[PDB]
Every structure is written in structure tokens, then in C-alpha cells.
Design a protein around this ligand. Structure first.
Ligand SMILES: NC(=[NH2+])c1ccc2nc(C(O)(O)c3nc4ccc(C(N)=[NH2+])cc4[nH]3)[nH]c2c1
Ligand code: NA
Ligand SMILES: [Zn+2]
Ligand SMILES: [Zn+2]
Ligand SMILES: [Zn+2]
Lengths: 252, 36, 11
């Protein structure tokens, strides 16, 4: 995260860490949506252009963290994966369209003050909160600058941007399964996700029922915090039926 | 898990559950043209 | 950079 501050303990209890076994390195961010399901970005797992194709056995999931490099004994839980499911129409060839994936954990995890799932939005929440100008929050243990890694989880709150503007900032074709967020060069504020923060959540706090809903997943960007550019996020709600389907087809 | 989450989802043990706010949630709620 | 984690999580 660039131009974001350190998070507070138990501020994002649903933030998960995909960790590679060998070498032991941070891979991406992810979120806890139930006690057995984690939601992340598909390209954190499969991206043929760079020979990336991870399997169950190659990852670990660490929940309850704050620090990036320490094994926070008695505070974090480390789970294994039982199955990874990538959206069947994820487009890695052209624009990372439907960049979403679900991982089922071997055993359910227990919640604590540091581990808690986030809510997935419903048509009415999605429609009232995804408006331009509304802010969301992103978190992760990714780079602090494009070219510089944090010790603690970082957080940044960014405004959602009007689709025409998102479009007029890139040569990539934007679909309805993505939205972009960030401050205009003109708004005197900065922030963005960066490498290492992919797969993590963009969430909003419903002013109706005080709950936090995950509206987007960190998907892609052109660099990290460049002016005139933005970060693109997968539109969780537009792909929710897919979610529901794997969950009530493969478990809960 | 599904719609509006899981039941007990989105309410943080240290904040919402204790009626405590984190230092920047105000910004967010203030951007939805203010909340409360 | 990361700290060793309990062997039991690799297997
Ligand atoms: N080594 C890895 N585990 C890794 C995984 C995914 C990556 N994806 C990229 C990227 O380089 O494709 C990339 N993912 C991005 C996510 C957000 C933003 C942003 N909002 N600035 C930019 C991004 N760039 N590099 C990556 C490295
Ligand atoms: Na920008
Ligand atoms: Zn990425
Ligand atoms: Zn990048
Ligand atoms: Zn609870």
C-alpha cells in the first residue's frame, strides 16, 4: 500500500495472507468470508504469462496477523487448503476479467478478536455504496513504493471513481466486473495498493447496519500511485452468484 | 459466505462489538454524504 | 525476512 498508514490491531480481522511454503514468502492478500472459505484474486494463483500456477500444496493461509514477517504465536492460525476454485471465465489473456478465486480450508478456523469474516454485499448494499466519491479501504503487506516493505499491515481509504474516468486512464478494456478507485491528481491526496496487496479486500462500512462488506478485491494497476492512474478491483457483487454456487455446491 | 455475509460477519470484536471506532472509519462514513 | 513457522504447517 502506498501512502497508507499502519493498521490498528484487529482493524481488518478478515485480512488473510497467502504464504508460499518454499521459499517462504508473502504471495498475496485474501479475505475470510466464512470459517472455511477464503476469497482472493485468481491471478495470485494462475497467471501463465509468468508461469504462475499454484496448487493447494504450494500455499498456506495465515489469518490473525498484523506483523508481516513474524509468526505471531497464539495470535495467528495457519491453515492448509483443501481446494482452490478459479472462476471458469477468468481472463488472464487480455484484461484480468473475473479475477476472483475461492479456496476451501482443510478445517474451519475459529474466530477470535483477531480473526472474523467480512460480509459479502447484497444487491441493495452494492447499489447504495458503490457510488463515485464514496470511500472504501484496502489493506495489505505489499510494497510501500513502486520501487520498501512494511512491518505491519497497512491501510488506505480511497474514493471510488466514475467509470468514464477509469476508462480514460488506460488502454485496457474495462468490463462491468471491475471498478477503479483512487484520488484524481487534482484532489491533493494519494494512495494505492501495490505489488503484494493483490487478492486483498476493498471494503466499505454500511451506514445502515454498521457492518463491513467487501466490495472489491485488489486486481491490477499500472504501477503504484502514479498520478492520472487508478487501481482496478474485481466487482464482488457482480460475481456473487458464482461465489454462492461454489459454496453451496462444495460446502460452506 | 453468501448474501450480506455470514450472520456474524462485518462486526469487529474490538471495535463494533465494543462500540469503539478505529481512527479513520469516520472518513468513509463521511463520504457517503455523512452517516448518522 | 519471514520468521520460521512451526514445522507442523508444512508436513
Ligand atoms: N510476486 C507475486 N506474488 C506477485 C503476484 C501478483 C502480481 N501482480 C503483479 C502486477 O504487477 O500485475 C500488479 N498487481 C497489482 C495489484 C494492484 C496494483 C495497484 N493498484 N497499483 C498494481 C498491481 N500490479 N505483480 C505481482 C507479483
Ligand atoms: Na493515481
Ligand atoms: Zn497482482
Ligand atoms: Zn505492479
Ligand atoms: Zn463474533
Amino acid at each position: 500500500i502506498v501512502e497508507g498508514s499502519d493498521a490498528e490491531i484487529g482493524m481488518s480481522p478478515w485480512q488473510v495472507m497467502l504464504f508460499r511454503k518454499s521459499p517462504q514468502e508473502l504471495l498475496c492478500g485474501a479475505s475470510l468470508i466464512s470459517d472455511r472459505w477464503v476469497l482472493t484474486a485468481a491471478h495470485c494463483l494462475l497467471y501463465p504469462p509468468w508461469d504462475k500456477n499454484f496448487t493447494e500444496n504450494d500455499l498456506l493461509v495465515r489469518i490473525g496477523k498484523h506483523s508481516r514477517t513474524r509468526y505471531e504465536r497464539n495470535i495467528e492460525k495457519i491453515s492448509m487448503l483443501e481446494k482452490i476454485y478459479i472462476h471458469p471465465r477468468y481472463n488472464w489473456r487480455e484484461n484480468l476479467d473475473r479475477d476472483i478465486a475461492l479456496m476451501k480450508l482443510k478445517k474451519p478456523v475459529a474466530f477470535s478478536d483477531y480473526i472474523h469474516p467480512v460480509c459479502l454485499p447484497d444487491r441493495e448494499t452494492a447499489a447504495s455504496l458503490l457510488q463515485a466519491g464514496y470511500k472504501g479501504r484496502v489493506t495489505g503487506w505489499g510494497n510501500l513504493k513502486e520501487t520498501g516493505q512494511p512491518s505491519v499491515l497497512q491501510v488506505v481509504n480511497l474514493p471510488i471513481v466514475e467509470r468514464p474516468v477509469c476508462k480514460d486512464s488506460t488502454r485496457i478494456r474495462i468490463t462491468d466486473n471491475m471498478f477503479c478507485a483512487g484520488y484524481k491528481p487534482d484532489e491533493g491526496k494519494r494512495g494505492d495498493a501495490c505489488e503484494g496487496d493483490s487478492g486483498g479486500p476493498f471494503v466499505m462500512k454500511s451506514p445502515f447496519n454498521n457492518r463491513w462488506y467487501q466490495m472489491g478485491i485488489v486486481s491490477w494497476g499500472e504501477g503504484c500511485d502514479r498520478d492520472g492512474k487508478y487501481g482496478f478491483y474485481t466487482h464482488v457483487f457482480r460475481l456473487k452468484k458464482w461465489i454462492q454456487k461454489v459454496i453451496d455446491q462444495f460446502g460452506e | 459466505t453468501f448474501g450480506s455475509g455470514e450472520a456474524d460477519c462485518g462486526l469487529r470484536p474490538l471495535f463494533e462489538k465494543k462500540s469503539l471506532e478505529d481512527k479513520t472509519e469516520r472518513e468513509l462514513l463521511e463520504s457517503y454524504i455523512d452517516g448518522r | 525476512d519471514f520468521e520460521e513457522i512451526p514445522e507442523e504447517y508444512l508436513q
